[PDB]
Design a protein around this ligand. Structure first.
Ligand SMILES: *[C@@H]1O[C@H](CO)[C@@H](O)[C@H](O)[C@H]1NC(C)=O
Ligand SMILES: *[C@@H]1O[C@H](CO)[C@@H](O)[C@H](O)[C@H]1NC(C)=O
Ligand SMILES: OC[C@@H]1[C@@H](O)[C@H](O)[C@H]2[C@H](O)[C@@H](O)CN21
Length: 862
């Protein structure tokens, strides 16, 4: 056994020969650092008993345990393998207990399979009998993708483990963590996964969400595949240089999906096809959001709002944190500190702005005849709380308002209750969206106000290396009881269930509107319902750098609307950091400056009406807003097809191995390259320029760099922004709100490729109605340039914007001087103004009016 291929048989303690011998494993203390001294023997685990049986979907096999040591308790003697050839690109297999029903994730989107095996499979499945192994190969090149034969199958009631070899070290995914880099360190590394209230820092702990998806780029051809484990129990993922990955979980079942694609993007599309594509957001959510913990008073909030508005900051959304509430209790506001809250809501609305309020799951149990608290009374009446293990008594914990009960969002009735609470509150404060927080669920006491009983749920035979090392730390007892089951099994599903229930509530509170939901805790599929922010970061240069892979990873998980707290939540933010963070932050798909309690102000206009920071912030935010039709179309593609929004360079340039570990730059979709300065004191960035024609966004000039590392000069007022030749970018003159901005003239940026051609698209709908895509009430158009000719084609034309929108400017990059510019509408002509910069090779066509929704040909000569 090559030492990189050793599968650690002692994950639970310092390795000894005595434990090694008791477990029947192999002992060799002479490897390098982290090489397991004790590893599994070559035969051990399960064997296929009898023949595989063909089914309509695929096949089943009976696996029988080869007796061995009972290390982590009650082992499963007869295992059923059920394999389903679900589509040409998606293989599904599950290992279950043959004679006992086990917990299986009650996912809202994913349905059980009742089909016939798909035809024309891009993969082949090979089963070995003695001992059991499952292998999934790519048919085209027989590349082994999944191969369990590197280690055993382990299947005890509270310890399940399967490993797979990997075809490369190009592995991206898993969460929620601060991985610091984007390409996984396949050196010996364990990542624990269990939804936990913890700090995203340099420690690499489990965080707020649970994301088992990873994608592997096989080689420079782009061939890629992905793996998803459908399991909501505590677990860890062990990575090793074989290269190999081991999933180690403490309940449920091993329910695996293997996705094949021809590109990394297609793998993400295959994954999101299964778990659920992200919601199309409200167009205003794409705007800049402003927030802080503890304005303290409405007057303080109003003062921040008005200095930023006075600064002409693009600024769509104001968030109200727990200081709006009466003593930190849901569905109230402070009648003294926040007196006039409803009038302030009207002010926001009249300014073209939106209010997002924070809401917490945990509900104060402090209610009496003399001082009723409605949310609690109404919730008790309905019996929708999480119960202690007796199954009848609501579990009592402690969060912001003191002692609290916790809604059971897995109960359908709880969503009815939750909806009515929002209905009643909306009648008082007309908020536009909801920020759901602390929904892991988080508890200021461990378990409950009286702790948790010592038992196998609260104290299991094996605990993954989760922060603190106890499941119940800062959350509910594992034996707590809910509709979908015991907390042990469904803990990782609380934030997901809460997002589902909050979207249900939006059906009533915001009829036929998308609204906006921001969630802390997530599970696979939460993007269908909500955006995410990366939690309680810190105002440091490390945190600025770590933001990028975290953003890219959530785009793989199908939560493309993701970003950090710009400028850093904890700590006073240095001006230079916040300036660079705001430059970068204008390009996070979710863009919010948020600040923790008590720290110095970090809202852009607090640095000075004339400061370099405010000026730069406004500049790059005006650029973000200009490119909102482009961003919005990318979200339309993420919603309808499953594309990423913030995208790794390698997803576009996978043929180029120099892009495989790039995590300090990213793309918006296929065509905009963002290069932030990420280092203190720096006015330069060491950057990678991919294999394409690139144009400086502001000047339009073609860079001379192609396929190489560069020192990009980026003074304190700049971030690198380049447009990819070959792409057409729809724009819209910006305003301080998207309400206003959406009524402005549009533009096209045509960045020509080496062949003087370019292509693009634009999606347009009302920007807020739910179902516009499903119901085909939208405009979709395509732009193509092939020497001397721009064509605007209309493929879907069932929405006409009432604001007479039209492209009134076309900027062509990398062009020779255009002459005789003709504009035809269905072949019918019809002279635009043409301005030309011979040094830069930029033409701008103005005095033109291409109505959104109409087909045109713009023609020119040279
Ligand atoms: C919690 O207990 C109440 C009775 O107090 C009951 O009506 C409800 O069904 C219980 N919920 C669960 C998940 O057992
Ligand atoms: C920008 O928005 C304001 C409202 O705040 C509006 O009055 C103004 O006319 C808008 N700009 C354009 C170009 O219409
Ligand atoms: O509402 C109080 C704070 C917010 O300011 C913060 O963004 C959020 C984090 O999840 C925790 O720090 C708790 N929440």
């Amino acid at each position: 056994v090559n030492e990189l291929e050793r599968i650690n048989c002692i994950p639970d303690q310092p390795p000894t020969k005595a434990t090694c011998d008791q477990r029947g494993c192999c002992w060799n203390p002479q490897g390098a650092v982290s090489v397991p001294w004790c590893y599994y023997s070559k035969n051990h685990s399960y064997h296929v008993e009898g023949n595989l049986v063909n089914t309509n979907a695929g096949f089943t096999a009976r696996l029988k345990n080869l007796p061995s040591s009972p290390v982590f308790g009650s082992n499963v003697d007869n295992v059923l393998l059920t394999a389903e050839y679900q589509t040409s690109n998606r293989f599904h297999f599950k290992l279950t207990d043959q004679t006992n029903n086990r917990f299986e994730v009650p996912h809202e989107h994913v349905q059980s399979f009742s089909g016939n095996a798909a035809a024309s499979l891009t993969y082949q499945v090979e089963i070995s009998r003695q001992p059991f192994s499952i292998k999934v190969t790519r048919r085209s090149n027989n590349r082994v993708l999944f191969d369990s034969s590197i280690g055993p199958l382990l299947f005890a009631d509270q310890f399940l483990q399967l490993s797979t070899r990997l075809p490369s070290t190009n592995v991206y995914g898993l969460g929620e963590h601060v991985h610091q880099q984007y390409r996984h360190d396949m050196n010996w590394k364990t990542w624990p996964i269990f939804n936990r209230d913890t700090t995203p820092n340099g420690n690499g702990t489990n965080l707020y969400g649970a994301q088992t998806f990873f994608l592997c780029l096989e080689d420079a051809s782009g061939l890629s595949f992905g793996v998803f484990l459908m399991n909501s129990n505590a677990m860890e993922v062990v990575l090793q240089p074989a290269p190999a990955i081991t999933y180690r979980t403490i309940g449920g079942i091993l329910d695996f999906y293997v996705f094949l694609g021809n590109t990394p993007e297609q793998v993400v599309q295959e994954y999101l096809e299964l778990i659920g594509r992200p919601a199309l957001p409200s167009y205003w959510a794409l705007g800049f959001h402003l927030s802080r913990y503890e304005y303290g008073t409405l007057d303080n909030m109003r003062e921040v709002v008005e200095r930023n508005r006075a600064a002409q900051l693009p600024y769509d959304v104001q968030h109200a944190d727990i200081d709006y509430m009466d003593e930190r209790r849901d569905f109230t506001y402070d009648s003294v500190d926040f007196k006039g809250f409803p009038e302030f809501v009207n002010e926001l609305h009249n300014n073209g702005q939106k209010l997002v309020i924070i809401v917490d799951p945990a509900i104060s149990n402090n209610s009496s005849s003399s001082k009723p608290y409605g949310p609690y009374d109404r919730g008790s009446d309905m019996k929708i709380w999480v119960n202690s293990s007796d199954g009848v008594t609501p579990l009592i914990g402690e969060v912001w308002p003191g002692q609290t009960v916790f809604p059971d969002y897995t109960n359908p009735n709880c969503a009815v209750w939750w909806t009515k609470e929002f209905e009643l509150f909306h009648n008082q404060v007309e908020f536009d969206g909801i920020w759901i927080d602390m929904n892991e669920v988080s508890n200021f006491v461990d378990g409950s106000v009286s702790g948790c009983s010592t038992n196998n749920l609260n104290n299991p035979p094996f605990t993954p290396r989760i922060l603190d090392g106890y499941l119940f730390c800062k959350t509910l007892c594992m034996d707590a009881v809910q509709h979908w089951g015991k907390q042990y099994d469904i803990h990782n599903l609380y934030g997901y269930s809460m997002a589902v229930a909050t979207a249900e509530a939006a059906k009533t509170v915001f009829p036929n509107k998308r609204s906006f939901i921001l969630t802390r805790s997530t599970f696979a599929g939460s993007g269908k319902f909500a955006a995410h922010w990366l939690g309680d970061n810190t105002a440091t240069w490390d945190d600025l750098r770590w933001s990028i892979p975290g953003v890219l990873e959530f785009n793989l998980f199908g939560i493309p609307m993701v970003g950090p707290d710009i400028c850093g939540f904890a700590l006073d933010t240095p001006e230079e950091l916040c300036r660079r963070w705001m430059q970068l932050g204008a390009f996070y798909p979710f863009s919010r400056n948020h600040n923790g309690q008590g720290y110095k102000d970090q809202d852009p206009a607090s640095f000075g009406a004339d400061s370099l920071l405010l000026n730069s912030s406004r500049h790059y935010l005006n650029i973000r807003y200009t490119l909102l039709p482009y961003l919005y179309t990318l979200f339309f593609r993420a919603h309808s097809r499953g594309d990423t929004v913030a995208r790794p360079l390698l997803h576009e340039f996978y043929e180029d191995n120099s892009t495989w570990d790039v995590h300090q730059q990213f793309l918006w979709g296929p065509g905009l390259l963002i290069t932030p300065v990420l280092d203190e004191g720096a006015e330069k960035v060491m950057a990678y320029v991919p294999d394409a024609v690139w144009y400086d966004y502001e000047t339009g000039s073609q860079v001379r760099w192609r396929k190489q590392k560069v020192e990009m000069e980026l003074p304190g007022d700049k971030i690198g922004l380049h447009l990819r030749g070959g792409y057409i970018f729809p724009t819209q003159q910006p305003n301080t709100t998207t309400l206003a901005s959406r009524k402005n003239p549009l533009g096209l940026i045509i960045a020509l490729d080496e062949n003087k051609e370019a292509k693009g698209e634009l999606f347009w709908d009302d920007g807020e109605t739910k179902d516009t895509v499903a119901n085909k009430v939208y405009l979709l158009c395509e732009f193509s340039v092939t020497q001397n000719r721009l064509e605007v084609n209309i493929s879907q034309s069932t929405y006409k914007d009432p604001n007479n929108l039209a492209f009134n400017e076309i900027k062509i990059l990398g062009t020779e001087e255009p002459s005789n510019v003709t504009v035809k509408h269905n072949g019918v002509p019809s002279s635009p103004t043409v301005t030309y910069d011979s040094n830069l090779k930029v033409a701008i066509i103005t005095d033109i009016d291409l109505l959104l929704g109409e087909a045109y040909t713009v023609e020119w000569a040279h």
